[PDB]
């Protein structure tokens, strides 16, 4: 009775692929928040990460100028003058970007004036040391800026009202200390001088929810790339606290113990030996 073609045509009656039928427009929380308010904890994190990634490029520029004036990539000397001009313009642009984002900084342009005089007047070794000087100076100023900015985050942690915002703020430091950089983009010492370690230990101690303690343990684990933070951790007696997380009582567990042993391993990462014993513990 039925036909394949007839059935096919009978079912193609309602077929046909349409354009987008569901729209749904968003009402931006971020726009209203950033234009009706002066927020100071998330915007500060975005700002410090931005400053981080800019500081990276500034650093590699300094390194490039160093390589030029070292006699390595040197092909000409007025070329080095032009390169110096580029370096100074970049530096001043970084400064202008800082001031544009509303962060003031005391800058006694001494080393820069040294370099500026030695360049405006005119030996390559005479300029190399000036470049290295400006490099160190810029590094110091940068680290001070980072300290000042991170301070806001740490304070925001130690003075949190809501537990959710507590979680978020505790995680923001973990996201910031995702990867440690040894150069301009270093945030480690900024967390060291602001005693983030002691704060996070305070919250792995006093707080009442296991999950939050776990988060704090994770952030602590991220911070243990720098030795100063480890010594600072041992000073507050954090090892005993972690050993209390592990060693018997039934109130904390699951994620918390995981982040605890993670922190313990990350700290004991000074010398790998018990890991092989853990391998022998896995082989059987």
């Amino acid at each position: 009775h039925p036909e394949p073609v007839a059935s096919w045509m009978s079912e193609q009656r309602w077929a046909g692929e349409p354009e987008v039928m569901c729209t749904l427009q968003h009402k931006s929380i971020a726009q209203e928040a950033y234009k009706n308010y002066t927020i100071t904890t998330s915007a500060v994190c975005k700002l410090v990460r931005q400053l981080q990634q800019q500081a990276l490029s500034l650093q590699v520029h300094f390194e490039r100028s160093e390589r030029v004036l070292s006699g390595l990539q040197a092909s000409s000397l007025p070329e080095a003058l032009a390169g110096a001009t580029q370096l100074l313009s970049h530096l001043d642009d970084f400064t202008a970007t800082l001031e544009r984002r509303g962060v003031f900084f005391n800058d006694a342009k001494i080393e820069r004036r040294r370099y500026e005089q030695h360049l405006e007047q005119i030996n390559l070794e005479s300029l190399l040391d000036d470049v290295q000087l400006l490099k160190r100076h810029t590094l110091i100023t940068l680290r001070l800026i980072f300290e000042r900015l991170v301070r806001v985050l740490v304070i925001s942690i130690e003075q949190s009202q809501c537990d959710l915002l507590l979680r978020a703020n505790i995680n923001m430091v973990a996201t910031l200390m995702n990867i440690d950089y040894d150069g301009f983009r270093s945030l480690s010492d900024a967390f060291v001088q602001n005693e983030a370690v002691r704060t996070l230990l305070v919250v792995v101690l006093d707080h009442k929810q296991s999950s939050v303690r776990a988060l704090a343990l994770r952030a602590l684990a991220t911070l243990c790339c720098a030795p100063q933070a480890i010594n600072q951790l041992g000073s507050c007696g954090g090892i005993e606290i972690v050993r209390d997380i592990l060693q018997s009582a039934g109130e904390r567990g699951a994620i918390e113990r995981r982040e605890a042993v993670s922190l313990l391993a990350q700290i004991t990462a000074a010398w790998h030996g018990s890991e092989h014993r853990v391998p022998g513990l896995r082989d059987c």
């Binding site: 931005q50 990634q53 800019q54 490029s57 642009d93 970084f94 970007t97």
Partner: peptide, 13 residues
């Protein structure tokens, strides 16, 4: 566009 705002973010104007 994304590249524009990204390079702006990085200061490579």
């Amino acid at each position: 566009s994304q590249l524009g705002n990204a390079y702006f973010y990085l200061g490579d104007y």
